[PDB]
Structures are given as structure tokens and as C-alpha cells.
Amino acid sequence: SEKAGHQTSAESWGTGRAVARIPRVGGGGTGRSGQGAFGNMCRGGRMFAPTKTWRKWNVKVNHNEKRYATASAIAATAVASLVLARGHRVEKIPEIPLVVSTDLESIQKTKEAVAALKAVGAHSDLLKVLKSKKLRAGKGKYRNRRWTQRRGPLVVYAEDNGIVKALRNVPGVETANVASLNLLQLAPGAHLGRFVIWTEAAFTKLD
Amino acid sequence: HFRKHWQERVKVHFDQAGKKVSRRNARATRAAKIAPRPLDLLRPVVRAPTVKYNRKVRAGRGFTLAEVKAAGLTAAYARTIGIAVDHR
Amino acid sequence: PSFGKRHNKSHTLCNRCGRRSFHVQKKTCSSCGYPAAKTRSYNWGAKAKRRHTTGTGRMRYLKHVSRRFKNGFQTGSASKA
Amino acid sequence: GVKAYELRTKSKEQLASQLVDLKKELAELKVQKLSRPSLPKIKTVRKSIACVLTVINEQQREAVRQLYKGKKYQPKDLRAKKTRALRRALTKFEASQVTEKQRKKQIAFPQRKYAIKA
Amino acid sequence: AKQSLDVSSDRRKARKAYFTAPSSQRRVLLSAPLSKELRAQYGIKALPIRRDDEVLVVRGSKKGQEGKISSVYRLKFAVQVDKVTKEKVNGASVPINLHPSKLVITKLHLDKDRKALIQRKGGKLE
Amino acid sequence: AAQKSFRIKQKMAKAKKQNRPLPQWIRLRTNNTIRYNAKRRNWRRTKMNI
RNA sequence: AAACUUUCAACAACGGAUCUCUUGGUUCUCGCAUCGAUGAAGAACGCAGCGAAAUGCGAUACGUAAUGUGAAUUGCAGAAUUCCGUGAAUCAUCGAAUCUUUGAACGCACAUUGCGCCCCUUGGUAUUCCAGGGGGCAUGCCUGUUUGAGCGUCAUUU
RNA sequence: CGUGGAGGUCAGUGACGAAGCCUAGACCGUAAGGUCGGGUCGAACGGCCUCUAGUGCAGAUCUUGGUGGUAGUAGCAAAUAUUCAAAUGAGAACUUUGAAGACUGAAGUGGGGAAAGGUUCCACGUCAACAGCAGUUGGACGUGGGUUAGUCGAUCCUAAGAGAUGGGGAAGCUCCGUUUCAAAGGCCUGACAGGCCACCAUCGAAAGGGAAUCCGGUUAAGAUUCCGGAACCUGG
RNA sequence: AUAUUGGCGAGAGACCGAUAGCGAACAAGUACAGUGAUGGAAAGAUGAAAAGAACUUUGAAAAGAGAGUGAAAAAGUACGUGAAAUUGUUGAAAGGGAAGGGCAUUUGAUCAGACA
RNA sequence: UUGACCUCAAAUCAGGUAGGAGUACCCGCUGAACUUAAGCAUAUCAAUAAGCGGAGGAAAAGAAACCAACCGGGAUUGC
Ligand SMILES: [Zn+2]
Numbered sequence A: 001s002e003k004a005g006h007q008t009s010a011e012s013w014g015t016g017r018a019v020a021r022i023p024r025v026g027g028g029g030t031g032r033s034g035q036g037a038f039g040n041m042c043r044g045g046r047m048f049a050p051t052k053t054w055r056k057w058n059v060k061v062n063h064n065e066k067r068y069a070t071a072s073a074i075a076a077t078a079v080a081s082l083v084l085a086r087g088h089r090v091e092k093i094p095e096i097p098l099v100v101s102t103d104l105e106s107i108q109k110t111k112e113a114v115a116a117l118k119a120v121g122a123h124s125d126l127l128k129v130l131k132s133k134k135l136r137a138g139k140g141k142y143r144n145r146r147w148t149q150r151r152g153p154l155v156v157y158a159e160d161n162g163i164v165k166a167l168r169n170v171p172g173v174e175t176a177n178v179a180s181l182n183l184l185q186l187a188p189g190a191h192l193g194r195f196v197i198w199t200e201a202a203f204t205k206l207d
Numbered sequence B: 001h002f003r004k005h006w007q008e009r010v011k012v013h014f015d016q017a018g019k020k021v022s023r024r025n026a027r028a029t030r031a032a033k034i035a036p037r038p039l040d041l042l043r044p045v046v047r048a049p050t051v052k053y054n055r056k057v058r059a060g061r062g063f064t065l066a067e068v069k070a071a072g073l074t075a076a077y078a079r080t081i082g083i084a085v086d087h088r
Numbered sequence C: 001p002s003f004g005k006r007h008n009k010s011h012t013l014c015n016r017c018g019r020r021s022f023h024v025q026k027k028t029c030s031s032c033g034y035p036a037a038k039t040r041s042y043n044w045g046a047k048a049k050r051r052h053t054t055g056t057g058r059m060r061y062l063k064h065v066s067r068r069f070k071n072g073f074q075t076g077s078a079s080k081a
Numbered sequence D: 001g002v003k004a005y006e007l008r009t010k011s012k013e014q015l016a017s018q019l020v021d022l023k024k025e026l027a028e029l030k031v032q033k034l035s036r037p038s039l040p041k042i043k044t045v046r047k048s049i050a051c052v053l054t055v056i057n058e059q060q061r062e063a064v065r066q067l068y069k070g071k072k073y074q075p076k077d078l079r080a081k082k083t084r085a086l087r088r089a090l091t092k093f094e095a096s097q098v099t100e101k102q103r104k105k106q107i108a109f110p111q112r113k114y115a116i117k118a
Numbered sequence E: 001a002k003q004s005l006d007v008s009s010d011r012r013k014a015r016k017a018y019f020t021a022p023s024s025q026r027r028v029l030l031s032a033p034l035s036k037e038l039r040a041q042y043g044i045k046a047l048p049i050r051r052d053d054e055v056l057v058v059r060g061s062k063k064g065q066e067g068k069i070s071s072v073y074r075l076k077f078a079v080q081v082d083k084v085t086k087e088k089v090n091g092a093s094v095p096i097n098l099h100p101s102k103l104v105i106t107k108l109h110l111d112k113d114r115k116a117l118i119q120r121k122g123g124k125l126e
Numbered sequence F: 001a002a003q004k005s006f007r008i009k010q011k012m013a014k015a016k017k018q019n020r021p022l023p024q025w026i027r028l029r030t031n032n033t034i035r036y037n038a039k040r041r042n043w044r045r046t047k048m049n050i
Numbered sequence G: 001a002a003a004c005u006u007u008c009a010a011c012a013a014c015g016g017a018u019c020u021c022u023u024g025g026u027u028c029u030c031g032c033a034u035c036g037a038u039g040a041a042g043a044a045c046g047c048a049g050c051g052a053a054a055u056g057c058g059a060u061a062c063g064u065a066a067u068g069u070g071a072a073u074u075g076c077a078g079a080a081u082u083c084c085g086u087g088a089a090u091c092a093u094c095g096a097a098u099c100u101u102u103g104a105a106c107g108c109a110c111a112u113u114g115c116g117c118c119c120c121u122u123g124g125u126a127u128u129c130c131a132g133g134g135g136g137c138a139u140g141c142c143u144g145u146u147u148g149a150g151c152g153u154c155a156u157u158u
Numbered sequence H: 001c002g003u004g005g006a007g008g009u010c011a012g013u014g015a016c017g018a019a020g021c022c023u024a025g026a027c028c029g030u031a032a033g034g035u036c037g038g039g040u041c042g043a044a045c046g047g048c049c050u051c052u053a054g055u056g057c058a059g060a061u062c063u064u065g066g067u068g069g070u071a072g073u074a075g076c077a078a079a080u081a082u083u084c085a086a087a088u089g090a091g092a093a094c095u096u097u098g099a100a101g102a103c104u105g106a107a108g109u110g111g112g113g114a115a116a117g118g119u120u121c122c123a124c125g126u127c128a129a130c131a132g133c134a135g136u137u138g139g140a141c142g143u144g145g146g147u148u149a150g151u152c153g154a155u156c157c158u159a160a161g162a163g164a165u166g167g168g169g170a171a172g173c174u175c176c177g178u179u180u181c182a183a184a185g186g187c188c189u190g191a192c193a194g195g196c197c198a199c200c201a202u203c204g205a206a207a208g209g210g211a212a213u214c215c216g217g218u219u220a221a222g223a224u225u226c227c228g229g230a231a232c233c234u235g236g
Numbered sequence I: 001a002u003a004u005u006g007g008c009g010a011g012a013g014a015c016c017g018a019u020a021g022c023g024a025a026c027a028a029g030u031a032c033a034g035u036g037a038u039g040g041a042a043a044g045a046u047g048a049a050a051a052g053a054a055c056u057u058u059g060a061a062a063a064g065a066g067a068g069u070g071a072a073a074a075a076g077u078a079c080g081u082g083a084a085a086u087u088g089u090u091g092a093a094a095g096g097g098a099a100g101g102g103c104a105u106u107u108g109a110u111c112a113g114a115c116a
Numbered sequence J: 001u002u003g004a005c006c007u008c009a010a011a012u013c014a015g016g017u018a019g020g021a022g023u024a025c026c027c028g029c030u031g032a033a034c035u036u037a038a039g040c041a042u043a044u045c046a047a048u049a050a051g052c053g054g055a056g057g058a059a060a061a062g063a064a065a066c067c068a069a070c071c072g073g074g075a076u077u078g079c
Helices: A063-078 A081-086 A102-106 A110-120 A123-128 A139-143 A200-206 B016-033 B065-071 B075-081 C046-052 C065-070 D012-035 D041-067 D092-096 D100-108 E011-019 E023-029 E036-042 E112-120 F006-018 F024-028
Strands: A098-100 A154-156 A174-176 A196-199 E054-057 E066-073 E078-081 E103-107
Touching: A063 A081, A098 A110, A098 A200, A102 A196, A102 A200, A110 A123, A196 A200, B065 B075, D012 D041, E036 E103
Parallel strands: A098 A196, A154 A174, A154 A196
Antiparallel strands: E054 E066, E054 E103, E066 E078
């Protein structure tokens, strides 16, 4: 608040023997009488840099720089050293960068979607996820940051015909257009190489 | 320029985003209320003042009385039909 | 020893405020301005307003207004579906 | 206990007699209180009284409404209560009241229902 | 997941809306499943609870036991089935608070409203 | 004083009927913190200022 | 040498740090507009079967009736049949209602539960008396009514 | 190096016991600090790349809380002064009773009142606290009981005095003023007409003015109040 | 269209996590002081559930010892974990007007690692 | 004499209304000082805090006695 500690009527005394010049509370009879207030130090006084709303919360970025980063992040996938370092237990599947049918996008069903992914070979990744459900380390638990699970693949979609509502729910998974391409989804923690499953249409549309 | 006590009067447009959504929702609401109409009045072309900008044109306020009469209709029907008017 | 002679009140109760601040030689309260109409609302003291204001006590009527507006200031009874 | 729908049919004199019986019963039970530790039937009694009184004050109100029916200046505690402002303010008809000039205006030149393709 | 704007995803909210909830909502919070026999019978998975129901227990130390409710203590979110008690040292005995998430019914006490309820929830009763 | 006004008598009644400790039967209710009556009073200890 | 003083370990005490929780607080955002002379906000006094407070509440007093829910409340006691049900609960909802003395505060006054005025009605043996019950008596202002004043202008007379 | 939080990561540790804590038990690093074993404990937490901050204490006559020496020390010493037996109970320098001794010595250590206090008044039960010792006692604690009015008093009067309305100022909250630049109010016959009168509010004294009451008895506790008897005042 | 530290109903958080955050997470603008204006706090956690300790015994009682519930009383309403100052008992050691620290070693206690 | 009219009045006249709280935001009125100006004094802090009136869900302002000086623009408000 603007007024922490200001809800006090303290004032300093002058010269004494066991005392300080810190302002003491007026009145009598309640225990806060004669107690100090109005300082960085004192119990139930204010603080130093009473924080404010007008901090520099959101930071500006150049558009070209943002796009440069998206491009590099998408380049990340083709090499697969970065992927196998970051996570993404891929070592069985033959090919990188993956492409699949555009017929994926017509899927309307979680079960069919995950069965497709298991056929393709992301079994290892979606069993890494759904075994890495551990709690949060500290006080995030009671600021609604409670569970934490490792991240999983990303299924690009050129145009949705229900895949997004299939993969909304199974954990680890995200979906994303070719236009939006959330860098926070692609290169998390500034660690390149998220595991990606493109479709034919989206890959063509990337050109 | 802070010798005054500015610290109580500060405006911080966090709500840029929320205002935007409310605004788009208001647009859509007015349009669905106004369902067949185009949500905007036809506004003319006008050539600006202040010789710096005289090359440009600008979508002004309202067309005129005389131009409407040259089209061969009246203001009274224009403002129903979806057309603006300035008179001054 | 000059407090043997304090048995003689200045201040006593107000019928409105119940704070024992009715001054007697002046016939005026000091918290709520009674006899006067306009209740004493002084912005330099914020705790005072915070103590005496709305929300504190019963709100016999005004707690019902939100309910009443929400259901539209209606009259009648139910239909016994 | 007592059930109000049983009572809505009864007459005024039946109601008063029933109630006075309940009052005598209550004054007995308040004496029995001082013998016993406690006597929970007094609760049922003291709310039966309220049921009857509520029914009476409801019925007389409805009769007075039927007396004052279809009329202007019905009494203050039977006008609506709504709020000070939403009494001291304009009605539907009184805001719809508008001069004949603008009536002709809104008649001849109303906002037409149009679109744009062609 | 949550795709709405009027429901909470917050601990400080829902613990309050659990603890300080009325009895009319605790009636529903203290639901219970049914045996798979009764499931095949009635065409329904779960129900609220009632004073006059027979039940069998499936979890806790008191697994295998069964009996009839004597009371439902909603103010502790608990149910007291009789023949499930603990002897005090002094020969007296106590009921046992259980959550009806951890019970299973084998017989009910139906009323008109309960038949209407099962009809409301996909009844196959008879 | 003993030429006391009715309202003085009327607030004295409230003090005299507040000044009882907690009925014991409240001690056993479910989820009770209220163990000692803390707004209790005596007459030489605390004035009431009328 | 014991005792005493002094360092340490274990164990125990004073004391409540740390750790882990947390129906709370702040901040941001969104949506909405609703106090009152038909008597508000607020205060006071009283109310529970067994309570002082918080919460609710007004002599119909932790509440009445209406509706939905459909078998409770719960610390003890007790009504418990009301349980295939015009029906339980400190339920939820709330549209009819009650709302003590007070308060802008309204008959006058109010450090007082004081002092009046009017009217309908009931009782006490009553034309007179006494009491009770019910409803009323503020101020400024507006529109209207009813009633008046003034040689202020004016027409028509002893 | 370390700390609270955040993005990722170790498909990390975790009831077969996380964290924290204790440990003259071990290892590391020059050092900040880390690591390990044992004991206690009972539910979350950490390693690494990066981020962000309310980020690290011996001190501020610092703040809040707690605890020590001093110390079983100073001191409980004004108010003449207490003593013996019995009961109670477990226990008496102290409670109760009884026998003696003293005192206040009537401008009192008496009995009643005012202001103020407000159940302290009385009984029963009872001591963990309070009564700067102790306590079986108590203004302490729990449960209850108890305050009776035509005549005492308030209310009524007005005092110095404050204070409405009229009215006038004041930007205005509200102010000057208290009968004044006011159409202020009610009758008296008597056939809607005649006639007379003159104020001005109201508040302010439980000690001033003022209508009238005594005795005896009565209770655990009150009486010009109740009971028994006997008088009075006012208005009908 | 725009403002909004008040009010009503809702949603979130790189916020605080009981000396922080509103002054208040509990019967808080409550207790309490003041003539009054106004000032103004401290105070969270047993356990899953009281299962909150009947019963035997000592004592006037508090209470203790026993037994007992319970996963544990190393959780007994003085209740989670329960640090430090400070305090006691035991064990070890030392001691003539000082103590503590530093370099090396003796005495005593204590201790990890490897022999394959 | 009687009577239109004007003005001024009284009524527990019929019917109506205003006050007061709240007060973050909003329209007005009145209106300081510390501080700052190496000091000091017009000045700044400030047409602000305090005080007072008055409203709503938004208020206020508003279809020009405008800006301009351009091939002229075109109510208001906000950014
Ligand atoms: Zn007052």
C-alpha cells in the first residue's frame, strides 16, 4: 500500500537514557504505547522502497529481433543434438524434422490423437511427461503454481478442425499455428530445440 | 518537472489490454444489435488545411447539404440510409 | 494530590452516538455534532470515518438492496410449480 | 406444530380464539420453565403464535387491497417500496411522451434497415 | 481445462467454499458411489446419502464392515454407521466419522423423491 | 449517586448481565476456539465510563 | 581431596526462533448501478430450551409466512413422525409482512423513558370521572381547494 | 559463494521418513560456504543453465519479544498491641466464638448523606489465581436473592444565563438577536354579524421557591415507601 | 468513447506468509488509556477422529506413579517441529589476584580411511 | 349597499416534495504554509491538502459568436 505505517501517530521525544530518537507511538495502555514506528527497521513500520505499480513490468522488444529469434528457434529442430540435450527422448524415431499428414487436423478426438502420436514414436516423451508430475519447490503452491510437469512435444497445425480440442488436455502437449509460433512455447528457458511434429500443410505454408 | 507532489496523480495504462477486449465486445454487440447495418456511417473525402498537410485528404465529418441535393435526395433520408451530414 | 477534586463530569452520553462525549456547558457533542443535523465528517481524520461509517453495524435495510435489485424490485409471490 | 395453510381457510374469530388459547398455554409453560430445567415445546408455541398473527395481518391487507382496488391513492404502506429515486423519477409513459413535431419526424424519416452488397 | 470466466482455480477460494458451505450443498458434497450391482440395477453411478441407508465400507481400517446409518453429521462432513464404533475405556462407545466417498451402498431407503431423482439421473430402477 | 437516571440503570443492566463467564456447554461444540470470556469485566478493575 | 567457579556432551527446563501449512491481506483487471421522510447509515436496549461475545433478529424477536431443495439439527436435552411426504434443518432463495426507544427526526422538550392537544372505540355501577386500546398534531416550498383582509384599481347604491 | 521466488531441465529425492534442528563424529574447499554419518522430526524439497528481486549483519543511546548478573540482596520498620483455650478443618502468629488487655475518646477508627462508583449490599459453595507474608477468611471466584411511595426528591418556577421563530447578514458551514421594522394568539354573550382583551416562546437548581404523613413492627439485606393502626393535601 | 484507493458480484498473480502483509489471518477498529477530540494492540497450528486418559494406588487437592487409548505422548488443551541467550542433574577435566586467542607438542577421551 | 379583479394571508386543508448518511471518481466557492529560490521579499510548491456547498452511475462539456489564413477544416470528450 501507499500508507503502510502512515496509519500511526508517532513522533520522537528528544533525549533520554535507554531510548532512541526513533519516533514512538502516542497514547497509553495497549502495548503499542511507546513502541516505535516509522522506519525500515521497526515492527509494524513501513519499508524501504515501498514498492509501486509503476515499475517497468513489460519490456519492449524490436520486431526484427523477435522474428530473428523465432527463426533460429525453428532452425533448432533440424539438428536434433539440441533436442536430445534438452529432453525429448527421441532416439528411436528415424527422421527429423517430422512431417505428418494434413489429415491430422480433421481429428476430433484425444484418443485418436494420442494413438497417432504413439504410433509415430512420442510414447517416450508422453511417458516422460505424466511421470514427471512433481510438486513445486517453494511458496508457489499457494500462489496457484502448484504442480509442475516437464514439457512435451508441440503439434503444429496449419488450420484447426478439432486437433486443438483433442490436444487441449493431454499434458506436455501444446499446439500452435505457423503464424503465431509462440517463442515461449518453442524455446523455453532460452534452451532451443523443442520437439515438434509438423504437418504437410504447415510445412509448405512455412515457405 | 517533479518538484510538485506528482506521486498521487499517476495513470498507468495496465488496462490497455482489457479495454481492448471490452471495446471489441462493444463493437460486436452494437453490430449484432444493428445487425444488417455496417456499423459506420459513410464519411466523405476532404482535403486538409495547414499547407504542411494540404497534399493529403482526410475522412471528414459529413458530406454537405448541396452535394446531397446534387445526388438528388435529402439529408432527412440520408441519416436513415447510413450517410452523415455536416451543415456548417 | 490535585485529583481528589475530579468527580464533576463535563462529558456525558449522546443519544445518537453513544460515545460519552456530550459536553454540557455547551450542550453539544464533539463526535457527532448533536443537536446539529450534519454528522461530523472530517477528512483530516480517516480512522474516524472508518470507525463510524457504513458497514459497521446492523444495516437492517441496506444489506438487502443488492438482493432486491438483482431480482428486479418485484412484487408478488411464487407460482408453486 | 401449526401449519399456515390449515389457517388460511379459518375465520377471524377462530383465529383470535386459537391464538388466545396459545397465549394461555404459553403463560403456563413459562411457569413450568421455573420448575423444570427447560421446556422446548415453548418454541413450537411461540412460533405458532407468529404463524397465526402473520396470517391475520396478511388477510386484512388483502381485504383492504380489494377495498382500495382499481383506484388511485392507495395508502402508503401498500404502494410499492422500491426506492426513493425510482419513485421520484419518470415513468415509461412519461418518457415516451414526446412532442408532435418529433413524432412526425420519427414517423416520416425513421432509421431504415439497410446493408451493403448492392 | 477451465475455459470460462466465472469459476475459480484457486485454493483460497475453494477451501472457503467447501468449509463455509451450507448444509444444502454439503448434502451433495457428501455423495457416494453405489455398488456395481446397484449400478447395473439403477443405471447410475453415485448419489447423495441418507439416514436410512445400508452400506458397506471399502477403505480405511474398517474395511469389510457394513451396516446402516444412524446419523449424518454434515458439520464434520461425516457419517455414522452403527456396528462400527470404538469402545471407550469406560465401557461406553462412540460413533465413527467416515467420509461417504469411502463407502459403497448395497441397499437404500427409497422414497417418492428418490425414484424421481433416479429418473432425473437416468433411472433404470424397475 | 443513587438519584440515577433510567438510562444509567439501563446500561448497568447490560454490564450486570454481560458479567458472567462462559456457560460450560459451549466448551464442547465442534470447532470452537472461544475458551475464556475475554470481554468479561469487574468494577474496581475497569471503569465503564458510564 | 570434596564443595564452589569454568568449558563441553547427553538428558531435562525457561523461551518460542527456524521449517512446512494457511477460510486472511495487498495489487491489477473485468462487469453493474442499488441508501433515505413509505422514515436510511448509525447508536441503545432486549431476543435463543440450556449464551457472555461475533453472526442473525425485533415483544410475530439466532426468527414468521411463500417457493425450491427432499430427512435434518447436533455439545447436552428434547419435539421427533414430518418421513412414498402440502414436509426437517441455524439450508438456500426471498417477491408478503412485523420492525421496541431512538436517530435527518417530525406535537413541545430530551444529563428527564418528563409535559401536552385532537378524534373513534372498550372497560370499570357512571350524562360529568379514571384508565386502556387505535389513529393523528414538525418546518420551508409547489399546484389546487375552502375561508378571509386591505379603498389597492374598478362598475353599480341608500 | 549464499538466500526468497520464476522459465526450463535431472522421466531427480521423498513414509523403507522430505525440510528444519542438535552433534568436541568424518570429507571438501585458502575463504565465503558446501558435503556426509548418527539422534530428534513428520511432508515437502533440491542439483544444473538462465531470470527477477523487499537478497547476506556484531554494532545504529537501533526495533519487537525474551533472558541474565546484581540477589534469595535492598526491603516488607510511621500509624502505641496484642495474649490464652475450644470448634472448623489435613494445616492456624492471621478465620469464628468465648475470657482478659489496649485504642479511636464524640471538630471519632461511630451512624447517615451529596458528586462519583455501580451489584461492591445478603446468603450458600469454594481457593488456581488477587488481598505485595500465609489464609479454612474477604469488597476476590461461581451460583442466586434483594432496591416496593398520592405525602422524601426529580417533573413545576424563575435566577445570573444559554437559546428557537420573525427578520437581516454571511459565498457558505451556520451567524447577530430573544420580543424586537410580525396579519404570532382566544374568546364572551348575542342575532354570520357586532364587542373586549395583549402577552409573548421554551430550557436552566435532586442545596434556592414549593400542596400534604406519623408511630410501632418487619427482613439475610431496604423503609417518613411494605404490614398493623392512625391523619393529611389536591382534583372531582 | 474517458476517470474511479468508495460500494456490489466475479477472475487472476515472477506479491507478503504471522516482528512481513490492511492497524486486525483468531469474538478487531474488540479489549484498553484518555474528560474528550482522538489514540490503539498482543494473540494462528494437538491428532485423521478426543480416541481429551475410565480403572488401581499415594496424598487435602492440584498432581504424581502405575495401567490404558493411539502410528508416536520424544504431541496431555502449559499441546506440531521446539533452536539461542539463560538454568539444573549426571559424566570428564582444570583452577593460588583474571579469562578467552595464536605456533608446536605431551597426557586423557574420541574418530574416519586401507591392508585383500 | 352589493360585487368583479389585484395583492397578501391562515388552515392537523386534498395531493406532493427537500433535508441526512455516503463521498474513490465528478461541478463549483473560499484558499494557506512548510519546502524551493547558497540567503531574501514578487515567485514556486498551488489555482494543490484542509474547510463548505451539490449530484449521478458516470458527471461535466457539447452542435461554434471555433481553429484558421492552407485547394481551407468542422460539435464535444479522451489517447
Ligand atoms: Zn454523539
